[PDB]
């Protein structure tokens, strides 16, 4: 709730103040003058724990708040940027974008709501990716994972596209970086997901609703298989056994979709007369068939398995 942070008028006032401070920093920098980001940092209210929901977290409920984030990062140092990431991960369940992108809390999102989710995904996740790829050590990445696991219902976060993608980024970065602390932290994360891994795949009624609003012929689930690939890759054999068991029905459902597309391709390609529209139809079927093969193989190959010629076998 917006009232748990000071209300709509207070947060909108904070955003306007943030913009004023960024415009001043940008003007000073452009004119080749000295810059002091103290006023801008203070206008963000990150160290402010006066409210049930931090004012920075509520600012992220608005497009204006989201859109200024890369520009904010141009004027901050490493520890300030890390404090922002720590705040985001600490209050991730209170983030409106998580509630909007979760099929559990928002089973029927409007087109406007879907656009907000795509915006947060494009801007915020690109910032997190760049920062962790360049300015983060083992302790700091481990710290962010612990912030996520200790302050949130991790299973609820996985019902959200943003939540799932944020976890994939942390896991993938941790995997690139001893073995020991990461094995322990991966296991704590695995505990919060165990018996609930199937819940990362949204219901069919949810997919239908999104597909109808976006004019999608197929639901894009590449991010789910990317998460499963990163979870499997950092896991021991026992973790992999559990993952495969929990998503077995989803593996077979994807194979069925790919096989239905292969049949459609065969039926349409044998037609003698082929207009530009039928060629568009065939190219669309082949693209979506190969997409399902590739997304599933991203997950399978990691465990030394492969889906080829209608069967899963050893790689």
């Amino acid at each position: 709730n917006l009232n748990k942070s000071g209300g709509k008028k207070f947060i909108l006032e904070l955003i306007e103040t943030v913009y004023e401070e960024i415009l001043d920093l940008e003007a000073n920098l452009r004119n080749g003058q000295q810059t002091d980001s103290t006023a801008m940092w203070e206008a963000l209210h990150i160290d402010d724990s006066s409210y049930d929901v931090n004012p920075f977290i509520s600012m992220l409920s608005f497009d204006k708040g989201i859109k200024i984030m890369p520009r904010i990062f141009n004027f901050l140092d490493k520890q300030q940027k890390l404090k922002i990431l720590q705040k985001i991960f600490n209050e991730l369940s209170h983030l409106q974008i998580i509630i909007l992108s979760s099929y559990k809390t928002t089973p029927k999102p409007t087109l406007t709501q879907l656009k907000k989710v795509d915006l947060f995904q494009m801007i915020i996740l690109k910032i997190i990716v760049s920062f962790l790829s360049n300015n983060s050590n083992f302790i700091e990445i481990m710290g962010l994972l612990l912030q996520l696991i200790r302050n949130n219902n991790v299973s609820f976060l996985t019902t959200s596209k943003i939540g799932l993608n944020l976890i994939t980024i942390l896991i993938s970065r941790a995997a690139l970086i001893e073995i020991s602390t990461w094995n322990e932290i991966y296991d704590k994360l695995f505990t919060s997901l165990e018996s609930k891994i199937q819940l990362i795949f949204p219901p069919r009624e949810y997919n239908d609703h999104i597909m109808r609003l976006q004019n999608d012929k197929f639901m894009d689930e590449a991010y789910i298989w990317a998460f499963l690939a990163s979870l499997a890759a950092s896991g021991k054999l026992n973790h992999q056994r559990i993952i495969i068991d929990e998503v077995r029905d989803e593996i077979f459902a994807t194979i069925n979709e790919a096989e239905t597309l292969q049949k459609k391709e065969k039926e349409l390609s044998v037609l003698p007369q082929r207009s530009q529209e039928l060629d568009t139809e065939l190219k669309s079927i082949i693209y979506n068939k190969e997409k399902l093969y590739q997304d599933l193989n991203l997950f399978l190959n990691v465990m030394g398995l492969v889906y080829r010629d209608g069967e899963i076998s050893e790689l």
Binding site: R241, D245, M303, G304, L305, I312, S313, E314
Partner: peptide, 14 residues
């Protein structure tokens, strides 16, 4: 390291 052996079987078994 031999993960494909058992994993392929668990994917069918249950």
């Amino acid at each position: 390291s031999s993960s494909p052996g058992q994993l392929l079987d668990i994917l069918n078994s249950k």
